[PDB]
From a paper:
Based on the previously published results for typical class 1 ASNases (Derst et al., 1994; Schalk et al., 2016), we tested two mutants, RrA(Y21A) and RrA(Y21F). When crystallization was done in the presence of L‐Asp, the ligand was present in three out of four protomers and the main chain became fully ordered. As expected, the phenyl group of Phe21 occupied almost exactly the same position as Tyr21 in RrA(wt), leaving no room for any water molecule(s). L‐Asp was bound predominantly by one chain, except that a hydrogen bond was made between its amino nitrogen and the OD2 oxygen of Asn26 of the adjacent protomer. Although both were less active than RrA(wt), RrA(Y21F) is somewhat more active than RrA(Y21A), which is opposite to the results obtained for typical class 1 ASNases. While it is quite plausible that in RrA Tyr21 contributes to proton transfer from the primary nucleophile (Thr16), almost certainly its side chain also contributes to stabilization of the tetramer. In this role, substituting Tyr with Phe preserves this role better than the mutation Tyr → Ala.
L‐Asparaginases (ASNases) catalyze the hydrolysis of L‐Asn to L‐Asp and ammonia. In contrast, the chain of ASNase from Rhodospirillum rubrum, reported here and referred to as RrA, consists of only 172 amino acid residues. RrA is homologous to the N‐terminal domain of typical bacterial class 1 ASNases and exhibits millimolar affinity for L‐Asn. Crystal structures of the wild‐type RrA, both with and without bound L‐Asp, as well as structures of several RrA mutants, reveal topologically unique tetramers.
Author numbering:
A (entry chain B), C (entry chain C): 6 to 168
B (entry chain A), D (entry chain D): 1 to 168
The structure:
Amino acid sequence: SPLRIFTAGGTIDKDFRLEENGLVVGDPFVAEVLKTARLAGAVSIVALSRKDSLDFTEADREAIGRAVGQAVEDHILLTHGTDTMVETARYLGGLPELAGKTVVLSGAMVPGRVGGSDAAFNIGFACAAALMLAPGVYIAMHGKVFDPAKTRKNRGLGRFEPI
Amino acid sequence: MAVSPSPLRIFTAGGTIDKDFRLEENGLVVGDPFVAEVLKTARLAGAVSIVALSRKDSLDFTEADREAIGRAVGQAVEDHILLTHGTDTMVETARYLGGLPELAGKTVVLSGAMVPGRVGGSDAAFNIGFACAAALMLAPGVYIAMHGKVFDPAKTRKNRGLGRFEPI
Amino acid sequence: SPLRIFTAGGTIDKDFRLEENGLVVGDPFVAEVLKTARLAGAVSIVALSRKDSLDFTEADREAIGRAVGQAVEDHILLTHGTDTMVETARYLGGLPELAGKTVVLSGAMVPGRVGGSDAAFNIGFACAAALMLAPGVYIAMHGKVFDPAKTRKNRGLGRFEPI
Amino acid sequence: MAVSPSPLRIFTAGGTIDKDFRLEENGLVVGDPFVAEVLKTARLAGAVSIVALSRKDSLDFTEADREAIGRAVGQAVEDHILLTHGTDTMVETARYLGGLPELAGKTVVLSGAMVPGRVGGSDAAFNIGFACAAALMLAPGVYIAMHGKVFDPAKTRKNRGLGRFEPI
Ligand SMILES: N[C@@H](CC(=O)O)C(=O)O
Ligand SMILES: N[C@@H](CC(=O)O)C(=O)O
Ligand SMILES: N[C@@H](CC(=O)O)C(=O)O
Ligand SMILES: [Cl-]
Ligand SMILES: [Cl-]
């Protein structure tokens, strides 16, 4: 079935810029991973945001909700910052218009363009989850599936964990 | 205090995925399993055992090479199994496993890479994430997870020229 | 002839830390490049500093000067931040105690651990410059040797340039 | 207004450095020149003209292969030249160039890699930086730059066993 991929930024997409002496949220890393994945099937990627998810407002979440509602596809991957991924996932879970869709949020604790990143693994795992899970809203990270209502991000731990 | 299960076990049978350069051969050999390098940086909640069954290019695979694999998979208590393997006889190995009543309650997923993990622009890390998900989320049975999709072994072939699995 | 490598930090050594949500100056990247360089010769690496060179003082340069004078080697590579590389190199150029040594400063505009880095090339180029140039102090960057007295860092181009 | 000179020219004659994985052949072939990928991100002050002469493994090399290299190097305007090359016949190529009086004013350096640039853990990027510096800074003559040092081709051999150049 067709997968639609939305990019909302996050650590996954960070890249070095000379002018900043540091990382900015750059081009979506998911496009770089899928470029060498030798895909059989139909995938389309759409840019929504280049924020760190720590800076997301109620209206940023509502804009993400609108974009997912404009998609005819029922298999959705949203790449995103880990810091408010739970907030975005809870918000999407509450929109009846998305009830028929399998929506999976994912990202990376380390930028894809930095050595030793989880990003490529997480993208493969999340693409499969978006294809294979029943309708609902999920966080796919650490090689497992989280329910957003019963999940938090534990910064001290460096992992999502159940409440 | 919740204890993370380890519901997935990985077996390695070699293939392009695991190829590495050696000075000795002046070429690629089947090296250490690349899946182990991907899981080291995957920040897994669980722990995943990685059992080495074989180290060949799948072209050189016999009925008893396939039968060794069958019994190792059979004796695993885990019901979620990923087997990394060469692409040239993956379909043959998958068909053989699909006939073992012993595996009837297991989700068994075969995967690899068309480009070695240790070579630039490889599909390996994506395919490992996809296939781990497949082994966890598909109903019991035997599957090939390649190219971002699930193949039925019985209704699949390998196109050697194009380096892709295709339906029949 | 034996090469001594001092690491003072800089963009070349930056690495991602979950805790900081960004880059820190990490372990020296020159050690990672030389690990796979299959060297025939005698090389030793010594850690001096992990600063961004923007934060170096006259006192820090004086310390760097004395540390380079501790080496009995006559061929020296100092990996260093690019922002005050010229100030450090001009300072060392005026130290009579270093007049018999070939001292080469280098670094990278992009961290070694980020994709698309100049670091490995710069380290190879700078190792050769330290071994092959006549006694003096030099900056090796952009595939050329700069005279520190006649050089500046021009953020306009993102490069060092002659004055 | 200041013009940056381009005093170094690079010629590529293939070798392990340039090997890349090809689905079709189920292995490594000599691919595009890896030196071009390193120089792309080196943020050079100048430009380096990179010219592909040959795509062999250095073993498939007859006097006529060497002779085309000798002419291309002889006709270059630049007096600083780097030739990337397989390590198995690097000494033979270097000794042949050392015999051409038209090269008398030129600093000519041969280099390559024991591991393909496109394989994990390669010496290539370091070897390219080191050899570029060597081509610019050594007096006229012909040299091999490998293992972070400079070799006299007359006094050097490739130890295929230990994967290194060494003195005789
Ligand atoms: N600060 C990042 C953290 C991450 O993505 O892992 C974000 O939420 O955008
Ligand atoms: N010849 C390889 C092909 C691959 O794995 O992609 C094999 O079957 O092991
Ligand atoms: N801010 C960095 C810049 C660099 O090294 O490129 C430093 O000078 O330490
Ligand atoms: Cl940063
Ligand atoms: Cl090969």
